[model samples]
Target: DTIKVLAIGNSFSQDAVEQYLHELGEAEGITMIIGNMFIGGCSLERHVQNIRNNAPAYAYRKVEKDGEKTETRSMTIEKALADEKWDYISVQQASPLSGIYDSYKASLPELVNYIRERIGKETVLMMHQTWAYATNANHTGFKNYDQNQMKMYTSIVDAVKKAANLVGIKKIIPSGTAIQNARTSFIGDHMNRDGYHLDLTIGRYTAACTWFEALTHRNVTENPYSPEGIDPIHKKAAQMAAHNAILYPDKVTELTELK
Candidate 1:
């Protein structure tokens, strides 16, 4: 059976599944139907409001042919949920509010309940832990964390955990933790496309690995989907970082298993 995953999120969701997730899944002999509900920098509160209003404010993106093509169209969250019997569904806060525990409010619980009622009881619900911004990120959202990368990262970890627990979500994508681990490698700040968003290449690649492992519960050490023109060593490091993040959730930033 094809594993169907849906992300009701923002651009961060795009970064998580964009580049290599489907490709890697296919290589591993897993068929996948990946869907992303995009709204640039959408927040949990906004998602709640959209649902209340039944707003068609999202660009529903469906990945086809293992990332070879994409089909996009405007959609409402309700429509997206009813479109398929999704095997897994992911939720996350906007990057700016991702680290702010107070930002979650009651919207998260409400949204979670709403989705649970629409989807199959067997559909696994998970949280996508978004990463912090670059130290020099000039985006206005960086001001929320005083432009401090570690501060933002740590806060996000705490906030995501709390929110996940509140909704009884047992699984997390751990994309943020994977990014933090990758930074310790040669990639450094190069992972950020701007000061905050992922760089389409290495950053997105690393995030894809993180999501792949999180969803499949498989080691990425032997995954063979490497982007062209990138260093093989860095690719392996990214994969290892992702592997450690999922396997050693407590020691994600201090991955020593493959060192």
Candidate 2:
């Protein structure tokens, strides 16, 4: 039986899952369907609203392989559940909310409750890590802060953990930290000059790391990305860090404490 995954979030979630499925198909013969519902700027609240407003478009459907890009349609959450059982359902807050610890604490419970009431099936929630810092003008104010980069990454990690605990979501895709690991290799010129998005090479690296961890429930140590800007050593380190993120969950807590 093939595993079916559904993703709900803004662009970050959509891109990550789509890329993951793409790489998965290339690397292995594993057949899986991924349904992605992501708007570039929508947040969790807006995503829920989209579901309420349009059921047919967001519900589950078989992912059609049209060469590289897959075609998708709406599958209402309730209808998706009724249609077939899902192996995993991943969700992420918009990048900005990645730092809002309280929002996640307040909202995850209600969202999980709604899913449970509607789907009537056990599901796993995944938290997609947000982007890096110092890359966005929006984060310019903190550019000079000594720990600015760490602050941005740690905030999102804390929020994800808090939400995980609140909703009992054991599955997490540690893409943010993976990017951090690849700092020297893929992140250096490879990052979007805007600092918000990753280039194709880095994006593929992130997807491969996340998918490996999700499937094996173990870490992956290989970095397959290559480009003039990304250093080889840095690429290897980034891949290593991705595995660490998946295997060492408690290590995150030691780095930051959120009230």
Mind giving the per-residue lDDT tens digits that candidate 2 earns over 1-259?
Answer: 3556677665566546665454444344445666666566667776666555644545233454432444445555556554446667777777766767776775666666666675534655566665555434354434433336667777777788788878877777777765554453424434443556555555555555665566545345543334344456544554565666666642332211111
Q: Relative to the true structure, how large is the alpha-carbon lDDT of every model?
A: 0.84, 0.57
Q: State the lDDT of candidate 1 residue by residue for 1-259, as single tens digits.
A: 4788899998899998856889879878877788899997899999999989999889988876455546467799999898778889999999999989878756799999889889777999999998988888898988888899888888888898998888899888888888888887666766898888898777888899988888787788888776786688878888977887787553346644324
**Using Cα atoms with residue i matched to residue i, what is each candidate's TM-score against the true structure?**
0.94, 0.74
- Which residue segments of model 2 deviate by more than 4 Å? 51-68, 73-75, 79-84, 120-122, 134-136, 139-147, 184-189, 222-238, 249-259
Candidate 1: regions farther than 4 A off: 65-68, 250-252, 255-259
